[PDB]
């Protein structure tokens, strides 16, 4: 019984990092994450 094999950390970190990186949200949804728009302050 070893712990590090027992829990694959990537399961979460890879999940979010991806699901941020594209608004794909599962699929089942998109258009939720964008690059920020740094044109001018008000933008």
């Amino acid at each position: 019984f070893n712990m590090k094999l027992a829990i694959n950390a990537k399961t979460i970190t890879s999940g979010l990092k991806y699901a941020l990186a594209t608004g794909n949200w599962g699929s089942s949804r998109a258009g939720v994450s964008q690059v920020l728009n740094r044109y001018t302050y008000s933008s």
Binding site: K10, I12, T13
Partner: protein, 79 residues
Amino acid sequence: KPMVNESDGVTHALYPQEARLRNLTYSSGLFVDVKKRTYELKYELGKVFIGRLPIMLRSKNCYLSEATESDLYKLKECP
């Protein structure tokens, strides 16, 4: 409080600025307590990493949610 595992192996705090230019990810890790146990059946005979969580900037978990305006310059982050 957010950091990076560099390839060599070293780990260290990371500042939002360096994240942008190292194409890094502004995350902080997670830790939970594990109670591994046994029963034999009616009777019973540390801290664990579970992932990296990106953090909204200017949140309590971000270094900046306190930092001074002057230091923001030393942090190279527009106030």
